[PDB]
Amino acid sequence: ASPFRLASAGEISEVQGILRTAGLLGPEKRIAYLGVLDPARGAGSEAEDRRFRVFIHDVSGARPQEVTVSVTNGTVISAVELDTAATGELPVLEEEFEVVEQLLATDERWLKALAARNLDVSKVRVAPLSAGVFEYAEERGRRILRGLAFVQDFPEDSAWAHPVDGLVAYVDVVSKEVTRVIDTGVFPVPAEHGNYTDPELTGPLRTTQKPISITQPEGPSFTVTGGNHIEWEKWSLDVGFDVREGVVLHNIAFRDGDRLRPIINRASIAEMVVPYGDPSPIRSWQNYFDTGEYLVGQYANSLELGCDCLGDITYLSPVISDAFGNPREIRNGICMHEEDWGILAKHSDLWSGINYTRRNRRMVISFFTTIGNYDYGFYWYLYLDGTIEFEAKATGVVFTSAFPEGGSDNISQLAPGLGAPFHQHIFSARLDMAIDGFTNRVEEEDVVRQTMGPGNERGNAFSRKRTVLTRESEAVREADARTGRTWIISNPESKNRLNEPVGYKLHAHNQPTLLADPGSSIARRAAFATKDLWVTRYADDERYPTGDFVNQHSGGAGLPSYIAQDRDIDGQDIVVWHTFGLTHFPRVEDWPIMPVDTVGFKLRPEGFFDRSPVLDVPANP
Amino acid sequence: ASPFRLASAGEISEVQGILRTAGLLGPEKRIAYLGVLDPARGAGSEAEDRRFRVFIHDVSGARPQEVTVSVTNGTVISAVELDTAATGELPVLEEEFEVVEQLLATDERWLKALAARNLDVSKVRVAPLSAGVFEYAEERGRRILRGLAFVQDFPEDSAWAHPVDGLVAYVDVVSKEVTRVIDTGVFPVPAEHGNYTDPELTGPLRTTQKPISITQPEGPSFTVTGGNHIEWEKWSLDVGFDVREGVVLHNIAFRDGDRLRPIINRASIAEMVVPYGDPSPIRSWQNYFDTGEYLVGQYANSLELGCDCLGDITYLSPVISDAFGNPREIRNGICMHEEDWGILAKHSDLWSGINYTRRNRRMVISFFTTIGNYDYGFYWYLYLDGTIEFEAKATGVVFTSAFPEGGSDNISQLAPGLGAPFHQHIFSARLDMAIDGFTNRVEEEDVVRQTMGPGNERGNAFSRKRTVLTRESEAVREADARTGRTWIISNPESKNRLNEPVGYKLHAHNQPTLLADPGSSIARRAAFATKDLWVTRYADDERYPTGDFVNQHSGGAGLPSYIAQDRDIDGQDIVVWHTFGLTHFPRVEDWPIMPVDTVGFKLRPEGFFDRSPVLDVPANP
Ligand SMILES: [Cu+2]
Ligand SMILES: [Cu+2]
Ligand code: NA
Ligand code: NA
């Protein structure tokens, strides 16, 4: 059995039993995060040691613990008590989400604000949002959630169409207490509904769409062994699942001849952040770190056949832990299929008379998560030609507000009285690189303009330069689309047949990075998001670009702390962190449910192979 | 019958008969371009007037003519004799291409250069390339092609693997005369073959690929009436074909309710250019304008079922003219199919309990052309949600050279002794805009960073600004990926229900533009390629960004001449020209046949609709 196998329902039960016995899994305890740790560097030969990391919360108010357990041996390995005013809170628990609306329902200041607006408290939904760190001194050390109100007219109604602006509450969901209710003014609650399944809003449905039928009469070309190890068209990898990061890709390698060559050791989306750009005091605190604060894999959808995934689909059903250590299955949470991808290569040669066409294919590994109004798809793509691509698909319902009658520079209007504040969705990809092994380096490649003159008499020449990043303090880079800037990850000790280092090139989309003022609270907590590319020396405890405890943590943790060590990264075991995201100015077409928008990155081989790696693909059947 | 119908074999025969009779289509004459002209503005009601533009070359040396004919009435409309030293030459003729290798075979300086290299003249292929304009005074007024040599070892051999460097010839293919042979030195002709169908190079073919079967058991969802008028999922357009531009899209419109709303009046790729970045005198003149000099639609492939186009395919077989006015069919030259495109919209709502998923689709219109070693696919995409996208796919065999033993800053090494000079592939899209009619304007939209302070106390705000382009002299714009720069085309006289102008947003890929020194010959001839975005006032005779006669024309023609008129474009009948392209640093994986690389642009609705235009799409079958 592979040490990268998915966690089992049996293993989850053992961890719960090991913690119960040890006295750490009491009845006031809650598991806020559970995941299997990755093997340590070099210990592949040999012996299992399935270890698990656990964050234990305490509903009574006591301090939480970080705990590691070995289930192959059966004991606790370490247990540490946390000072959360110091290192940040544990991730939000599912059961804390509803405490906010239920508490607020009996608070007098909140009842008072709803009565001024003539709203039946039983029709008011409260969205519980992460709190962040701002000026309120009484919140440091406290578990705080903030709450924004929407009206549901009837149980099937889309509450997002009726925001209650000028109102926000803050809640302590350990001591069950409403610290503040802030009421800045009454805004009309917008009246139109946004019910996208109502025949009155959709009109008659189309009858013009005829079916597309995608089938594989002989089955798919990939194999799955061991639960999660994939072999497809010379590719080899392990598909992991963590409750925080979601789908994680391990040991990506390509069979070149009869060498299995490594490419990436671990690939994940290790954080994301959603900052809002509305300076109103009702919303100027809202930023979520979906991955670090909420854990995106916990909210993975179960994907339906023919609706979410089309074709010959193979599913994985990852197991996570509920808040008491009971195993929970996410049935059909990961989809895997191959997809036709047009023409791979084509040439008709006049001089030889040979007409040559080959078709491309990709294999797709995806999952989809839902946190409140947002829906995010995560797609990994492997292509025949050695390309690796990631794509994020953002859909769902926009987060809404009132539209102020004067208009706004930070909000757009979707419908009469209804606004959608400006925001970004920013991702951090963490790529633990292993280009032909662990001795890797990063070069930055710029196009070079040349001046007309001697050596370049017709002024037609142009070139490129590569700059090696040698220390971590040099390795915080920004994009430059105008110079065609890319980054090459190479192995200086592994050469192709032309005696050049083997390499992969990273092509970014060059979207804007974090827009918030550099002195803001969000620029401190989401330092990673202010630059396109960071490179660190690998270390087992440096896993997330924002640190281990994102909820209510001050700034600084994560990447700006790692790179301060100024370690050697020239031909070393390195990690590339790529920031990319969407800047979302909502448009009318985004309402009342939004069409998918996409962002991503890709890596293409750059002299990794000795010639095209797809000469052996056959003429199509 | 629609006035945008494809030209017929009957109409081609009439134009040949009309020219013969008139005495303009002699026996020394050659048709170098023939195409149907677009209807004039406003003359839709009524009456046919199928007119055709013709460029007539003269093999004896006389001056060529530009000629327009009406075939519905049956006479010549105008005939004009051209001074080609003034306005540029006519496009290269197919039959001129081989005159270069056949002439050079009997030239003594060329025989002398091949003998020094021990090459059998019968094994030397000559690639005929456009000449451009450089320092040679004897070429102005002459029809000149330049010639670069490759060795074929046997009739099925890929000549591209064996360039003969240090050698070039120039040829006058009217007077049949080798003006110069330039021999700068002997280079070894690289020895390895590049035969990608040879079992010795491909090894054993894969047996692991299992079939993907894409079928539409009820047929496709689109209809074609009148030969070329398409209706699909509320979209309406006419698919035209011109021998110069290739697939041209007319009258793109969207049925919103029971209004047919126009979006784009004409869309085409109106030019492309391929500049090479190697300062060697053997190649420092090479730049091709595939569209303006060679006519890309003339070399369209016939697309095979299951190989080039997969699924339920409907073909168009456009008719063009050969060099004597005989109709020629391009069987299966245009492919049209619809394609599944993943998830369109998805949200699972906790508060209402509704789970909602819809799938996206796109309709694809494509053709593929082959000029010498290059193969280019042209893809137009229409999506359910109102998005329009163009994608160019570049494949084929790289253009090669010797790799100098010292190495090179402008060439990369593909194989022992074998180089591939750096180059770009740059496209110009011409979009004759008709957003809800012909009163349109262009705004440039930048993200706006805001400083922390009063009004923005937590430093989280950000905004956007729009700048209206009012005169043509203001409308030469460049990209700025760092500010998220996009361009919005709107109709200030057509408002959505929120009373804002309807609009479409142009999203560019922000790749580098023309790299050559601004004083170079290529920067003058390809002025369009030095900026990302140009906007002109519409005029019937302003069709190509490089002018009507690209071959051997001096610089200046086209866009920099049009915009000098400094016309009003604020709410007027306007044309957007978008430059986009690929900067190609060849890699080893590009050899010996290259995987497809892509570049493109898209346009998305920006408050064109009153809400999402895809609420009426049904749950999947
Ligand atoms: Cu958004
Ligand atoms: Cu190229
Ligand atoms: Na590494
Ligand atoms: Na126009």
Curated annotation (Swiss-Prot), chains A, B:
Gene induction: By phenethylamine.
Posttranslational modification: Topaquinone (TPQ) is generated by copper-dependent autoxidation of a specific tyrosyl residue.
Phenotype when changing residue 374 to F: Loss of activity
UniProt-listed Enzyme Commission number(s): 1.4.3.21
Catalytic reaction(s) noted: a primary methyl amine + O2 + H2O = an aldehyde + H2O2 + NH4(+); 2-phenylethylamine + O2 + H2O = 2-phenylacetaldehyde + H2O2 + NH4(+)
A GO term for molecular function: quinone binding
Cofactor note: Binds 1 copper ion per subunit.
Transmembrane segments: none
Disulfide bond entries: 309-335
Annotated catalytic residues: 290 (proton acceptor), 374 (schiff-base intermediate with substrate)
Binding site for Cu cation: 423, 425, 584
2',4',5'-topaquinone carried by residues: 374
Classification via InterPro entries: AGAO-like_N2, Cu_Am_Ox_Cu-bd, Cu_Am_ox_TPQ-bd, Cu_amine_oxidase, Cu_amine_oxidase_C, Cu_amine_oxidase_C_sf, Cu_amine_oxidase_N-reg
Cofactor(s) in the UniProt record: Cu cation; L-topaquinone
Keyword Cell cycle attached: no
Protein keywords: Copper, Disulfide bond, Metal-binding, Oxidoreductase, TPQ
GO biological process, one term: amine metabolic process
One Pfam family this sequence matches: Cu_amine_oxid
Positions with a binding annotation for substrate: 288-299, 371-376
Subunit text: Homodimer.
Protein family membership: Belongs to the copper/topaquinone oxidase family.
Known role: Catalyzes the oxidative deamination of phenylethylamine to phenylacetaldehyde with the concomitant production of hydrogen peroxide and ammonia.
Official protein name in the record: Phenylethylamine oxidase
